[PDB]
Amino acid sequence: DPIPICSFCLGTKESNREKKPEELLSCADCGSSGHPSCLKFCPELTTNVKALRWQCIECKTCSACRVQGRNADNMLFCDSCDRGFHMECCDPPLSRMPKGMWICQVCRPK
């Protein structure tokens, strides 16, 4: 199911954009993969994404309401775990996209 090729640079785990080995992250729904460096993930994000069932940007469903929803423009991605949320499904709901870093309700401490 996982495609052993990065969707952005077409390299395997043996050859990222700098021709160095780097493991692939793979979408659990469509199988598409990418190097974290090609996905522009930091190591923190990469390790946490390697704590869950990950979806690529095209398969991503809202973690609260469990659907992709109608508009692509109103989903934001957590800077800690890459989960997607509708603005309306945040806590509290967001009237406006924040600037800079944003962390989702799942990552925030109890």
Partner: peptide, 16 residues
């Protein structure tokens, strides 16, 4: 915040 628009600009297009 990171959105589909910002993410696609940061990664660039998928390789055809």
């Amino acid at each position: 915040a990171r959105t589909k628009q910002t993410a696609r600009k940061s990664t660039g297009g998928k390789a055809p």
